[PDB]
Write a protein that binds this ligand. Sequence first.
Ligand SMILES: [Mg+2]
Ligand SMILES: [Mg+2]
Ligand SMILES: [Mg+2]
Ligand SMILES: [Mg+2]
Ligand SMILES: [Mg+2]
Ligand SMILES: [Mg+2]
Ligand SMILES: [Mg+2]
Lengths: 52, 136, 191
Amino acid sequence: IIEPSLKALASKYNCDKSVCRKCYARLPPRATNCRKRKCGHTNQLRPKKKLK
Amino acid sequence: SGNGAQGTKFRISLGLPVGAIMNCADNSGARNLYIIAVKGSGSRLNRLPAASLGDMVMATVKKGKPELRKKVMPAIVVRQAKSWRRRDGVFLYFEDNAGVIANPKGEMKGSAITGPVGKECADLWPRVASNSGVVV
Amino acid sequence: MKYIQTEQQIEVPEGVTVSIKSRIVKVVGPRGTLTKNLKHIDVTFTKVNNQLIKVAVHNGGRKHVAALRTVKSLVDNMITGVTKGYKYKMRYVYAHFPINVNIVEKDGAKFIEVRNFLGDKKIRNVPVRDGVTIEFSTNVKDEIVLSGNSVEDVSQNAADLQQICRVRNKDIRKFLDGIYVSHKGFITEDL
RNA sequence: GCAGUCAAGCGUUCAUAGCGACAUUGCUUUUUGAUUCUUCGAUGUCGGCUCUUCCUAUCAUACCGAAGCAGAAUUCGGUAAGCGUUGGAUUGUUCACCCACUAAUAGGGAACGUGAGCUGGGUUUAGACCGUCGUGAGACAGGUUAGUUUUACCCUACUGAU
Ligand SMILES: [Mg+2]
Ligand SMILES: [Mg+2]
Ligand SMILES: [Mg+2]
Ligand SMILES: [Mg+2]
Ligand SMILES: [Mg+2]
Ligand SMILES: [Mg+2]
Ligand SMILES: [Mg+2]
């Protein structure tokens, strides 16, 4: 059972996240800069890949 | 004691290093087997890997029929000569070193086995005990 | 640029009565009591007329003035917590293996115990903090309800339960299995 | 040798999952040159054996993040040098190349670690042979054979002992 409501619940935490290109760190969806200070707070992000 | 080994073997004394020629217990054409490696051995500088009763080893037939010669293949030890202690208490040793040839699943290629076979080897390998004659 | 003086305004309702000395904020009301040590912040509190309190900073920078507004929201949440209360709901998500959760005792400490998460033999104990009170919701399938005065405790207790059930060495996009936070609100209705 | 920046293209679809031309900025002293500062009243010149420690640019092992990650098997990256990193056939070899096991068969430094520690197969004295060159004595960093490895009881360091 996928269940329409409970699928959207789990996808909020697992799927709907951005990722930093330099350090591969997980980030919030509408962020502008990476929070890690090792990569120098870079502004080069992308969306996490969709499943099929 | 691993490649399709039904059960676990308690430690025993190591009789056969690499370079030893044990006899061939089975009746599949081969006469004697030159051990080259031990399946499931450790690694320490300078130490030769040493087989024992019930182990599986890589062997080349030196003396025997021409089909079995010149191809590395697996085998199982069935008699030792270096004595070992059993948990029951007694020490024991066979008269000579011997071993059957068998594919890596652990199944006998030969039909029958001549001479006695160890009880430690018989329990660890089911298909050896099927053709086995005397068990100790 | 060094701001000459800045300030925010905490509005106190008719029920509660708050007390501050040095920077130790006691807040008492109908639900219970709360306390908070703020001796790391450097601010000034001032009373005006019972239902209004004025926080202030004098000759502060940019990062100093940022922490001023934080203190307002901390003391506000203590006031909303002791009046209305907090109520965090969470839901189970699974495909094949049904998760069976129950509250268990251990030296009178009270732990949440998760059994058979994704078909496992390990039993996952999670401690229950002081103040928070857990109960399983009847007439809604596979739901839990945490509640207490403090936000800091209730939310953190939900987060621990949330984070004890991760799937390791798998594609987390595919394996959507866990106990997730559904809705944050208050205990009492109306407000 | 190792690492960035930019991004025309590759990647069914899509610059940047993984790759990446034309360009351009660096780090390193495990390569080789350039130089001739120190030593020609001599600092024992290859390799192997033995033994300790250090480096990280991490092969495996701990915990994690990405993926064109369904599972399985892999690929790219982070914290990490805590703990490991083999047995052989041929060659004096370093290097190389095969066979086998293995969790894994990562890379380096310490006067290109280490000869009053060993060994002396190699290089580089005198004997001798062949080939090419030279009128000849002779040459060859071409091939082959045989050829002396000395001294600690001193001060320090280390290990134990009053
Ligand atoms: Mg050796
Ligand atoms: Mg000059
Ligand atoms: Mg000297
Ligand atoms: Mg590093
Ligand atoms: Mg040297
Ligand atoms: Mg010396
Ligand atoms: Mg002539």
